Amino acid sequence: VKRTYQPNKRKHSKVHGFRKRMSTKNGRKVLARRRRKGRKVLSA
Amino acid sequence: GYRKLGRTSDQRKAMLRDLATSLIISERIETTEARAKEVRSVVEKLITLGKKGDLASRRNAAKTLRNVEILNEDETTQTALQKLFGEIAERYTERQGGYTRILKQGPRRGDGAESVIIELV
């Protein structure tokens, strides 16, 4: 039975990576909310 | 049959052939209460063939005994068919039955079954 999650290194970085979040105006706001929260990992 | 010992028909008779052979190689083994109660018939009937010592009796014994090699002392290696017709058969030429004995030991750890000692008298 095929499941929902099939891990992949390339996809996890090109969709949720740091440079993907920095490339759009609404992605920089995501990093600002996590910086204010105090998360040890800002992005995947 | 007499009792089944929780085994299939084909694999029960294979276990009895191994138990009978081992009681000839070492002449003293330790096993379960129920298994030893029915190895008596197999072993004691096999010595009867050995006493006769016929060609028809020897081929009728080769269909129950396994193929192994005897090597304990420095002498030449021997089989199990040769040993039964050459050494065991000469110790009971004056005895009418009762070739084996059973001695109880007690329950064993982890299982609760009792072990017994069976050997050729």
Partner: protein
């Protein structure tokens, strides 16, 4: 007077321990040892060591003779529980309790 020995936090359920304990109450010292050595239970080796260690105290810390000794007290208490889990069907789980006991043996000369 009375000598005692205690063993704490033994990985055996208290309900199973008390089955063997009721067979040695008031018995002779040699009788109690013989009974524990001839039973094929799980707690028989454990309880015997507590009894044999209680007899050693009566012969060393006090001036007693170990031929008239009797078992005056023998009971099992309970200790902390180890809580594990087991996965059942349909994605849920059930709890598993791993219980422990405290075993005590008291030997009395009499008087």
């Amino acid at each position: 007077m009375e000598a005692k020995a205690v063993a704490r936090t033994i990985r055996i359920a208290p309900r199973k321990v008390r089955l063997v304990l009721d067979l040695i109450r008031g018995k002779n010292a040699a009788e109690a040892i013989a009974i524990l050595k001839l039973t094929n239970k799980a707690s028989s080796p454990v309880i015997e060591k507590v009894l044999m260690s209680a007899l050693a105290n009566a012969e060393h810390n006090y001036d007693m003779n170990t031929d008239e000794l009797v078992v005056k007290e023998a009971y099992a208490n309970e200790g902390p529980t180890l809580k594990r889990f087991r996965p059942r069907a349909q994605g849920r789980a059930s709890a598993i309790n791993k219980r422990t006991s405290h075993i005590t043996i008291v030997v009395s000369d009499g008087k």
